Amino acid sequence: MMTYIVFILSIIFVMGFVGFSSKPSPIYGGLGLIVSGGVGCGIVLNFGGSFLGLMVFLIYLGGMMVVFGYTTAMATEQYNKVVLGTFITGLLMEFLMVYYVLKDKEVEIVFKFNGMGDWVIYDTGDSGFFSEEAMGIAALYSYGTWLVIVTGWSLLIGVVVIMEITRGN
C-alpha cells in the first residue's frame, strides 16, 4: 500500500482532472485543478524533484491558478446531468484501468504498462553533495544561454502583447 503511494497519488491526479474536464463551473474547475496540481506536485516530490514541485506550488498554483480564479471571480455572476454523468464515466474508466492493472500486473491501453509499483525503476546510488535536479536547474545560466535569451525575450514580448491586446486601441 505504501510502496504504491505515487501510483495512489497518480490515481487521485487522474480523478482530479475528471474534477474539471467534465467542466462543472470554472470556479469548481479551478478548485479541481488546484487539488490536481497539489497531488501532481507530490508525485514530482517523490522522485526527488523538490525544486520542480515547489515551482508547481509557487508558479503554477500560487502564481497562475491565482490569476485564473481571480479572472473567473470577475466573471460568472454569483448565484448538472452531463457533468455528473461524464464525471462518473471518467471515474469508472480509471477504476477499470486500476482493477485491470492490479489483477494482471500488465495492461495495454495504447502502450504497455507494468502493474508493479513504480518504486522498482529507481536508481541505487547517491549523488554526493548535490541534487542532480538542482544542479541541472543551476545549469540554466552557464550552459543554457540561448534558452535564457529566447525565454526572456518571449516574456518581454508577452508583456508587450498583453499591453497591446488589452488596450483596445
Binding site: 470556479i27 478548485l31 506550488f57 500560487g62 481571480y70 548535490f130
Partner: protein, 312 residues
C-alpha cells in the same frame, strides 16, 4: 514522539496568537495615552479567553452563501497554511528540516490568497467580492518583492536551507550587508498580512462569516504575523547558536521576534492608511525598481568580492 513535537509546535502557536491580541490591545492602549484591558483578568490576562468564549457562543450570522464548499474551505485553507508556515522555521532546529524551506515558505504563502478569494466569492455581496479582489491583488503584488528580496538575500546564504541561514550570520547580522532589502522586506511583509498602513479591509471581505469562522480567519492572520516576524528575525537578525545549549538561540530569537511583532503593533498606531493606488504606487514604482537594482547588486557582488557562499 514526533506527534508530541507537532503538538508542541501547533498548540503554543495558538496560545501565542491568543495572547498577541491582548498584547496588541495593551500596546495600542499605552501608545494612545490610555490603558489596554486590565479588568477582565489580572493585568488583562483573561481577556482573550473571555473573548473566545464570547465568540463561540454568539449566534451564527447565517449567510446565503454562493458556494457552501468554498465557504467552508476558506477558513480551513487559511488555518492550514497559517500552521504549515512554521514547520521549516529553524529555532534552532525546525520541525521539518528540509533543503528548500525558504522556497517552501514562499510557496505556502503564495497559496494564502485563495482563502481571501474563496471567502470573497463565497459571499453573495458584490462589495465583499470587490474588497477580496483588492486584497488579493495587493497580496500578490507584494509577493513579487518578497520573492526577489528573498532571492537577493539568499545569494549570501548559498542555498534555500533555512538552517544554513543561521550559519550565514554567525559573524554579523545579515541586515548589515542588506538593510535596504531588510526595510523593503519589512514593509512588504507588513503589506502581506493586510496590516496597517496597508489594511484596506478595515478602511472605507470575510464579513459574511459568523463569529467562529471570522475568529479563525483572525487567528490565522495573527499566526501569519508572528510567523513572518520570526522569519524576518531568522532572515536578517540571526542569533548566536551554541549547539550544546540551543535555548540560547531560542531565547534570543524569541526576544527579537517579540520586538518585531511589537514593531508591527507600533507601526499600526502611528500612520494613516494608504489609498489603494498609493500602495500600488509604492510597490510598482518604488519598491520593485530598487528591488531589481539590489538584486543585480547582490548577484554581481559576491563575484566581485570573491564572497560566494558555499552550496552545502
Amino acid at each position: 514522539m514526533f506527534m508530541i513535537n507537532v503538538l508542541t509546535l501547533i498548540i503554543p502557536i495558538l496560545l501565542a496568537v491568543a495572547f498577541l491580541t491582548l498584547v496588541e490591545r495593551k500596546v495600542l492602549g499605552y501608545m494612545q495615552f490610555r490603558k489596554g484591558p486590565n479588568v477582565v483578568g489580572p493585568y488583562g490576562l483573561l481577556q482573550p479567553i473571555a473573548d473566545a468564549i464570547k465568540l463561540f457562543i454568539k449566534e451564527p450570522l447565517r449567510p446565503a452563501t454562493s458556494s457552501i464548499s468554498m465557504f467552508i474551505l476558506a477558513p480551513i485553507l487559511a488555518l492550514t497554511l497559517a500552521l504549515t508556515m512554521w514547520i521549516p522555521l529553524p529555532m534552532p532546529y525546525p520541525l521539518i528540516n528540509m533543503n528548500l524551506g525558504v522556497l517552501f515558505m514562499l510557496a505556502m504563502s503564495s497559496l494564502a490568497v485563495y482563502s481571501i478569494l474563496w471567502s470573497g466569492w463565497a459571499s453573495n455581496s458584490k462589495y465583499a467580492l470587490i474588497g477580496a479582489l483588492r486584497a488579493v491583488a495587493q497580496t500578490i503584488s507584494y509577493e513579487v518583492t518578497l520573492a526577489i528580496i528573498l532571492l537577493s538575500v539568499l545569494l549570501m546564504n548559498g542555498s534555500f536551507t533555512l538552517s544554513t541561514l543561521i550559519i550565514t550570520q554567525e559573524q554579523v547580522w545579515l541586515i548589515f550587508p542588506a538593510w535596504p532589502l531588510a526595510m523593503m522586506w519589512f514593509i512588504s511583509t507588513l503589506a502581506e498580512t493586510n496590516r496597517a498602513p496597508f489594511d484596506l479591509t478595515e478602511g472605507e471581505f470575510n464579513v459574511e462569516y459568523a463569529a467562529g469562522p471570522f475568529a479563525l480567519f483572525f487567528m490565522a492572520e495573527y499566526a501569519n504575523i508572528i510567523m513572518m516576524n520570526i522569519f524576518t528575525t531568522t532572515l536578517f537578525l540571526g542569533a548566536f547558536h551554541n549547539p550544546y545549549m540551543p535555548e540560547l538561540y531560542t531565547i534570543n530569537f524569541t526576544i527579537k521576534s517579540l520586538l518585531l511583532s511589537i514593531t508591527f503593533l507600533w507601526i499600526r498606531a502611528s500612520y494613516p492608511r494608504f489609498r489603494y493606488d498609493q500602495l500600488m504606487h509604492l510597490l510598482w514604482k518604488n519598491f520593485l525598481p530598487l528591488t531589481l537594482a539590489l538584486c543585480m547588486w547582490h548577484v554581481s557582488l559576491p563575484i566581485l568580492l570573491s564572497s560566494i557562499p558555499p552550496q552545502t
